[PDB]
Amino acid sequence: MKFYTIKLAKFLGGIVRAMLGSFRKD
């Protein structure tokens, strides 16, 4: 494949945490 598929997945998987990480439980 474009191999960029794995790269993007990581990129999103990096931001996904950042979003949730943005909001703190307490």
d(CA 4, CA 22): 26
**Cα angle value 13/4/14 (rounded, 5°):** 15
**φ, ψ for residue 24 (rounded to 5)?**
-95, 140
Element (H, E) at 1: none
Q: What is the DSSP letter of 23?
A: S
Q: Look up residue 3 and give its amino acid.
A: F
Backbone φ/ψ region at 23: left (φ over 0), alpha (ψ -120 to 50), beta: beta
- Solved how? NMR
- How many residues would you count in the chain? 26
d(CA 26, CA 20): 13
Q: Which two tokens stand for residue 20?
A: 């949730």
- Which 3 state secondary structure label does DSSP give 18? helix
d(CA 26, CA 19): 15
d(CA 24, CA 11): 21
